[PDB]
Amino acid sequence: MQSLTTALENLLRHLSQEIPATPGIRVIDIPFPLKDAFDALSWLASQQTYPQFYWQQRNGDEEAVVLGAITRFTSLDQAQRFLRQHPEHADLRIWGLNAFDPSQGNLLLPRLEWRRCGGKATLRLTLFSESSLQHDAIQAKEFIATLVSIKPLPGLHLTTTREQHWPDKTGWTQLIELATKTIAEGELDKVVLARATDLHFASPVNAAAMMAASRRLNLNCYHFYMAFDGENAFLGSSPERLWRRRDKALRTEALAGTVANNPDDKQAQQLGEWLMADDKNQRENMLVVEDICQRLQADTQTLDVLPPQVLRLRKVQHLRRCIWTSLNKADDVICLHQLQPTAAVAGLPRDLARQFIARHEPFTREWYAGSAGYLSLQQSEFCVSLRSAKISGNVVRLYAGAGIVRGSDPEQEWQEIDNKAAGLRTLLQM
């Protein structure tokens, strides 16, 4: 990175004299040796420029860091319009978030992108201008000059100042009770209802160190972290894919239905068997397959829903049914608007569930249960923003949700959302 800063500089001096004073984009790819292990997260955390986005594939074999926004997008829709004016760079990637409401996003064209696939990495610098590439070359130089060498990343040393649930247990029970009562009206089939837990600390929270702690313990999860700026962040470790797209081949999953994990393998496996056989959870999952299959009918070709599998995580396990289809169009706005929010996350029918949530949830989910990842012309991948946290100075808001369906027992659902909140909370309160 010392060497690559140097190589980037050397490159930039030359370009800033040669490149034309015309609008456009250059993409500069430099191989990034992983001869020596490089901790991208703790590197990113060293930097003083914003915004910053961290993302790791759930399989752990794809990892990215982006630093600085050439452009900011308020929706995936806006980002795709931009990509489509640049068909010549089909692998140009925009990175970041969709909020719970999929029509609002915070996505970036990264100034600097470190991306790893496997045991191999690339540093990409991009130059973009509306007026002059020559111009943006000099901004690029100043950006580089901003770079700071890697410092070690401290573990969290946090003193809890304040705690509050929205809703609390008492309020949760009446809510779940209300929700089941409403489902018993025969029109609403399912609603997913969540709790925000505001945690205040004696000091500001290092979101990057929170992210690292989660990557260390929350295995088999996608990790996403956006630093909006130095005081504000959204991150999490989610087991769930919204979609992945390679040209036209589309992958999604119905992931819904939960039991506790146990550290002991047999017990975990037996608990998973209980889940597979459980009517209530079966139905909780089947309602997602129904929603997803319907939502995708008009815009896709032959659909394959696989049999349910149990997916095992640090504190929780889930039923999961992969889904494969082909899009009619290679279009990420069709993917996001058809899919998000699925009945795993909002409910069914979509309208009645969205309305119930708008009416009775004592907080706005904002980034919670949206989506995180990247799109480019050729491929994209987003996860669902579950198992996630919004950090505001010294407050961490934790989110957890439970799908409500006929037969939901409030006390069991409280226990569910606690097990979900725990994957992140236990990192903050040792």
Largest distance between two CA atoms of the chain: 71
416 is known to lie in a ligand binding site? yes
Quickly count helices (H) and strands (E) in the chain: 11, 20
Q: In the chain, helix, strand, coil percent, each to 5?
A: 30, 35, 35
- 385/222 Cα distance (integer angstroms): 9
- 100/194 Cα distance (integer angstroms): 12
Q: Catalytic residue among 18, 63, 163, 190, which?
A: 190
For residue 51 the two structure tokens come to 């915004």
State the minimum distance, in angstroms, from the CB of residue 189 to Mg ion. Answer: 14
Q: Catalytic residue among 9, 120, 169, 240, which?
A: 240
Q: Quickly list DSSP for 75-132.
A: -HHHHHHHHHT-TT-TT--EEEEE-SSTT-EEEEEEEEEEEEETTEEEEEEEEEESS-
Helix (H) or strand (E) holding 249: strand 249-260
**Residue 258 touches Mg ion, criterion: CB under 5 A:** yes
- 427/235 Cα distance (integer angstroms): 13
CB 48 within 8 A of CB 148: yes
Choice between 244 and 318, CB closer to Mg ion: 318
Choice between 258 and 342, CB closer to Mg ion: 258
Choice between 284 and 381, CB closer to Mg ion: 284
**Residue 285 touches Mg ion, criterion: CB under 5 A:** no
Instruction: State whether the Cα torsion 283-289-292-294 is positive or negative.
Output: negative
Q: Which residues contact 191 (CB under 8 A, 6 or more apart)?
A: 179, 182, 183, 346, 347, 352, 353, 356, 357, 403, 404
**Residues 299-328, interacting with Mg ion (CB under 5 A):** none
Choice between 179 and 402, CB closer to Mg ion: 402
State the minimum distance, in angstroms, from the CB of residue 217 to Mg ion. Answer: 22
Range in contact with Mg ion (rule: CB under 5 A) among 158-166, 251-259, 267-275, 317-325? 251-259
Residue with tokens 């470190």: 114
Which residue, judged by CB position, is nearest to Mg ion in the bound state?
A: 258
Q: Is 151 a catalytic residue?
A: no
130 is known to lie in a ligand binding site? no
Choice between 240 and 332, CB closer to Mg ion: 240
Range in contact with Mg ion (rule: CB under 5 A) among 65-73, 95-103, 326-334, 403-411? 403-411
Range in contact with Mg ion (rule: CB under 5 A) among 236-244, 319-327, 340-348, 398-406? 398-406
CB 32 within 8 A of CB 43: no
Range in contact with Mg ion (rule: CB under 5 A) among 146-154, 323-331, 333-341, 399-407? 399-407
Q: How many CB atoms lie within 10 A of CB 426?
A: 14
Choice between 323 and 386, CB closer to Mg ion: 386
Q: Is 190 a catalytic residue?
A: yes
State the minimum distance, in angstroms, from the CB of residue 281 to Mg ion. Answer: 7
**Residue 102 touches Mg ion, criterion: CB under 5 A:** no
**Residue 410 touches Mg ion, criterion: CB under 5 A:** no
**Residue 403 touches Mg ion, criterion: CB under 5 A:** yes
Annotated binding site for Mg(2+): 284, 416
Residues at the contact surface with Mg ion, assessed by CB under 5 A: 258, 402-403
Residue numbers annotated as active site: 190, 240
